[PDB]
């Protein structure tokens, strides 16, 4: 019934405050909610849009700040003074009852960095992959022979360590099919114009 | 503040299956006015949480009725009389009896059954582009098992390395329902030209002893 829309992404350095935006179209008081790494939920606070009254959870009554836009029938959450815990997924819900899509935040003191994309060739199916380190901010795109090669395909989430991501992926095929035929990688990195293509050769 | 706990974190079905998952509260979800603000969400793969149930028992709108909450107090239950494809996904209660704050149960993980199969597992030297930058990482894919947990450990030289590692798993497959799992261990070169002998070794419920793929630096 009620649809939120949310802001997109945003990436902060430790110390620094994020605003994000929740505009409701549709026919409650506005609730924010942190969902970290785990999947775990984190009530931060309400607002009652009509006048403006506020709930904080203790744990961020200090550090968040919720307003509204009746105007524009937006709603504001501004958290400061941001921590690494505070790296999350980050809803506005109507009345507990709808949610909006969500906005991430990246908290991290990384400059964007292109990846360095490395081929992984084998020491009756056989198993290549294509590892991707030392990048931010997400995301990256990684397809096999131009999305033609899709089946026996596992691309592993990106993980942020050291204030880098790391991705990889492995592909596997019919002892046949390789070296006989080429397969590459294909990794985009639009943050850092990173296009590049790994073609995996036998060591 | 309130408690949730659910329970079980992860529960295997078989499509057509009853299923049932337990919310436990740490205190009376009873307020005084009489209400019990016990609710359930769905979040499936890739959305936002949705309303299935609030106060104990109250179907959502549009909420098929093969979705059905009961229970009292502190102890409350989530039932699927049969359970489809579009109901795999992350279950959550949560209480908003006493606030602030509103708490929620770490989710139970509604997932597909099915053999069980042992990892494929493959290991990687490093890229002699990486070696080129001083560089060294060493990546093991464990791929195509169930059930999803998985222990890895990295020897070398016959000893465990704990440092440098990073790993990542991915969702239950929408193919096979099986599950896999990426690690790569990052050195420098000088710590990968100072020992031959690399192996990733996995425990699994497919096998009493350890799994293991391994290779020798110098070829």
């Known amino acids: 019934e009620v649809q939120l829309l949310q802001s997109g992404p945003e990436l902060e350095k430790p110390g620094a405050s994020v605003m994000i935006s929740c505009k409701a179209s549709?026919?409650?008081?506005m609730n924010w909610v942190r969902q970290n790494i785990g999947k775990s939920l984190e009530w931060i606070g309400a607002?009652?849009?009509?006048?403006?009254?506020?709930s904080y959870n203790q744990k961020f009554k200090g550090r968040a700040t919720l307003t509204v836009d009746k105007s524009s029938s937006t709603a504001y959450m501004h958290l400061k003074s941001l921590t690494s815990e505070d790296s999350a997924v980050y809803y506005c819900?109507?009345?507990?009852?709808?949610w909006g899509q969500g906005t991430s935040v990246t908290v991290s003191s990384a400059k964007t960095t292109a990846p360095s994309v490395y081929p992984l060739a084998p020491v009756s199916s056989v198993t290549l992959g294509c590892l991707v380190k030392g990048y931010f901010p997400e995301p990256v795109t990684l397809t096999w022979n131009s999305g033609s090669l899709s089946s026996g395909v596992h691309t592993f989430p990106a993980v942020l360590q050291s204030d880098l991501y790391t991705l990889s992926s492995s592909v596997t095929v019919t002892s046949s099919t390789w070296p006989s035929q080429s397969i590459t990688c294909n990794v985009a990195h639009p943050a850092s114009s990173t296009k590049v293509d790994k073609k995996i050769e036998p060591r | 503040d309130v408690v949730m706990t659910q329970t079980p974190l992860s529960l295997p079905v078989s499509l057509g299956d009853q299923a049932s998952i337990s919310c436990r509260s740490s205190?009376?979800?009873?307020?005084?006015?009489?209400?019990?603000?016990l609710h359930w969400y769905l979040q499936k793969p890739g959305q936002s949480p949705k309303l299935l149930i609030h106060?104990?028992?109250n179907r959502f709108s549009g909420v098929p009725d093969r979705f059905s909450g009961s229970g009292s107090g502190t102890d409350f239950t989530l039932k699927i009389s049969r359970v489809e494809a579009e109901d795999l996904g992350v279950y959550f209660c949560?209480?908003?009896?006493?606030?602030?704050?509103?708490?929620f149960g770490a989710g139970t993980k509604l997932e597909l059954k099915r053999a069980d199969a042992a990892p494929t597992v493959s290991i990687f030297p490093p890229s002699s582009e990486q070696l080129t930058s001083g560089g060294a990482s060493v990546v093991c894919f464990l791929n195509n098992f169930y059930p999803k947990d998985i222990n890895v450990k990295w020897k070398i030289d016959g000893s465990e390395r704990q440092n440098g590692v990073l790993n990542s798993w991915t969702d239950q497959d929408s193919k096979d329902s099986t599950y896999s799992m990426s690690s790569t261990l990052t050195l420098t070169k000088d710590e990968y030209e100072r020992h031959n002998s690399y192996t990733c070794e996995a425990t699994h419920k497919t096998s009493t002893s350890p799994i293991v793929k391994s290779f020798n630096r110098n070829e």
């Open positions: 205190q009376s979800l009873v307020h005084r006015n009489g209400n019990t603000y």
């Open positions: 549709g026919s409650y008081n």
């Open positions: 607002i009652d849009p009509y006048y403006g009254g506020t």
């Open positions: 106060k104990v028992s």
């Open positions: 949560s209480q908003s009896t006493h606030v602030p704050p509103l708490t």
């Open positions: 819900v109507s009345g507990m009852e709808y």
